[PDB]
């Protein structure tokens, strides 16, 4: 079983900690959703290959530009997260996160992940976003961003309803295996 490292990058409340906790626990935490995620080594068998996948988070490091890059060494796959209920978090993908992830991690496969996809059919989310002349991130805008930033692929998921969660981490392993 080969060891490959996964790092998830993205804005503040983009749901990267939730995604990581949901996957490492298989289910969405019923009684308590933890504030932090330390690390997890996941046993994933994708397409007949057994891989040990280290999961890391950059949550809490967004403000500390000298500390944050210490997460990147030896990364084999980058999950670039953004929230579907926050079209302003997607604006920072080509402006802020992509140049950094390309400077520290050249040639490392990136998967652009659209989190909180359930919130597209949410009344309160559609209401509050409309008050700022906006609407939830459409799949075509996510695909167009993954295209513009030269990402390996684009994927959507919901840490809450668990839909799409298993499919992202398997695909991340497939990209990490690519040499």
């Amino acid at each position: 079983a080969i060891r490959k490292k996964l790092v998830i990058v993205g804005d503040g409340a983009c749901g990267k900690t939730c995604l990581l906790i949901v996957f490492s626990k298989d289910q969405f935490p019923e009684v308590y959703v933890p504030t932090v995620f330390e690390n997890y080594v996941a046993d994933i068998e994708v397409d007949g290959k057994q891989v040990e996948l280290a999961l890391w988070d950059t949550a809490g490091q967004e403000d500390y530009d000298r500390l944050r890059p210490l997460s990147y060494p030896d990364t084999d796959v980058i999950l670039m997260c953004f929230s579907i209920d926050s079209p302003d978090s997607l604006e920072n993908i080509p402006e802020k996160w992509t140049p950094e992830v390309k400077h520290f991690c050249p040639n490392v496969p990136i998967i652009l992940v659209g989190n909180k996809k359930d919130l597209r059919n949410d009344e309160h989310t559609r209401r509050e976003l409309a008050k700022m002349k906006q609407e939830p991130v459409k799949p075509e805008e996510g695909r167009d961003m993954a295209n513009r930033i030269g990402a390996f692929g684009y994927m959507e998921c919901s840490a809450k309803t668990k839909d799409g969660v298993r499919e992202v981490f398997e695909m991340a392993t497939r990209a990490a295996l690519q040499a």
Binding site: P29, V31, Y32, P34, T35, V36, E38, N39, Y40, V41, A54, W56, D57, A59, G60, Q61, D63, Y64, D65, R66, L67, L70, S71, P73, D74
Partner: protein, 235 residues
């Protein structure tokens, strides 16, 4: 870590750690506040466990089994003894604050009403200065540590065998030499997230809301200085 402290934080939350009949006598906001406080101590227990792995299992194991230059061990595990002493005092103070709060005739039921003062004392004055100066050191030497390890693993067959042997137990699956170093580097950035979520459910007592606000601004002050004091050393 010791068995007593492992069972005390083995549960997935505070509401699962205490008895069901004890939890039923508290308001939801108290349970939400205690859940986040419990997580701060549970993750501080895991942090000290990680430092004890580096000092006693890796660092110590390397001195007694392998016979390499002690400076190479110092470069592999920088400021670990100092970090161990800093967090063991913090965990000690967090664990006694929990024990003081214990309901009489119980070892699991507790309600921590005062936490702020403990966080202020920790993240201020000489303790904050010693912690700021130690984390700045650790993080500047972090990259050199990962490189020095990769070099030793790709050249030394006895060091390769030592690492295979110590990290064989399942308990250490996510705790290799490299995972431990990043685990430590990321610990300081967890506190503001934890202290902000405690502060969010601590608007019952005003002196507690102000103590948690002072500690929040104190942790960010420390993190900003730790971030401003980093200068990456090359191998």
């Amino acid at each position: 870590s010791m068995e007593m402290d492992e069972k005390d934080f083995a549960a997935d939350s505070w509401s699962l750690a205490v008895d069901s009949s004890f939890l039923q006598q508290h308001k939801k906001e108290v349970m939400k506040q205690q859940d986040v406080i419990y997580e701060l101590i549970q993750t501080e227990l895991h942090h000290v466990r990680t430092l004890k792995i580096m000092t006693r299992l890796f660092r110590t194991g390397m001195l007694e089994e392998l016979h390499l230059e002690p400076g190479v061990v110092q470069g592999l595990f920088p400021c670990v003894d100092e970090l161990s002493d800093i967090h063991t005092r913090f965990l000690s103070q967090l664990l006694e604050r929990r024990r003081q709060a214990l309901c009489p005739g119980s070892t699991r039921n507790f309600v921590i009403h005062r936490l702020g003062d403990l966080l202020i004392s920790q993240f201020s004055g000489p303790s904050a200065e010693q912690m700021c100066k130690t984390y700045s050191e650790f993080c500047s030497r972090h990259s050199k540590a990962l490189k020095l390890y990769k070099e030793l693993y790709a050249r030394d067959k006895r060091f390769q065998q030592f690492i295979r042997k110590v990290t064989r137990p399942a308990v250490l699956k996510r705790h290799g030499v490299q995972e431990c170093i990043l685990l430590v580097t990321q610990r300081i950035t967890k506190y503001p997230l934890l202290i902000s979520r405690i502060l969010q459910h601590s608007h019952g007592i005003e002196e507690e809301r102000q103590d948690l606000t002072t500690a929040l601004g104190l942790v960010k002050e420390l993190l900003s200085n730790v971030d401003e004091g980093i200068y990456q050393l090359e191998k």
